[PDB]
Amino acid sequence: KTACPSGKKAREIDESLIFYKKWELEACVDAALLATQMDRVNAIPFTYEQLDVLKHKLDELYPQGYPESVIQHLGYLFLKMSPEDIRKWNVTSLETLKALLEVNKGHEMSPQVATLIDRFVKGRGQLDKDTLDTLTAFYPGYLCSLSPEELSSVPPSSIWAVRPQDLDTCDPRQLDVLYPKARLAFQNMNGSEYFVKIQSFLGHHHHHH
């Protein structure tokens, strides 16, 4: 079937659409309307197949990848994305990253979230302070999951996002990379605070009994 029943053409994304059959959603809901009103989808308890119809509509409308104007409102529909879907995204806002990471809370990192994080950080050109705040907030061992080579390109400003417990899983090679960056970043600290906060970057426990 390829024709919307009379009077069923959707002019809004609203609760009435939950009663539509799958083919009715396909024939009656325009993809541009859906994309424009993604901020209303997650409050509407569509079934899995209904949401699959909507996701396919977005895929059809955006073969080159959803725009961030839609991504920022995907919500739990993020869990229906494939890694390939996410590789096309250009995500620049940290509010979008926080919104997407919130719906994955309580679970291990999936390939989808890994792709999302990797593409976001590469798009910013570096791991900046606020991004590291967010990533650590959702994944405490993110910083020390990076190799020394990866850590070497982290700007010292981002050290201000590094909390002492974040360094527990780091080894002396990673800490050899991070400690000089921390020396530079804490230039403007008061002496007492500097002495306290610098210690975790030395990882003394790795070197004595």
Residue numbers in the entry: 299 to 507
What does the paper say about this structure?
The tumor-associated antigen mesothelin is expressed at high levels on the cell surface of many human cancers, while its expression in normal tissues is limited. The binding of mesothelin to the tumor-associated cancer antigen 125 (CA-125) can lead to heterotypic cell adhesion and tumor metastasis within the pleural and peritoneal cavities. Here, we report the crystal structures of mesothelin that reveal a compact, right-handed solenoid consisting of 24 short helices and connecting loops. These helices form a nine-layered spiral coil that resembles ARM/HEAT family proteins.
Here, we report the crystal structures of a 207-residue MSLN fragment, of fl-MSLN alone and in complex with a therapeutic mAb MORAb-009, as well as the structure of its C-terminal shed-resistant peptide complexed with mAb 15B6. By truncation and alanine replacement mutagenesis, the CA-125 binding site was mapped to a 64-residue fragment at the N-terminus of MSLN. The N-terminal half of mesothelin is conformationally rigid, suitable for eliciting specific antibodies, whereas its C-terminal portion is more flexible.
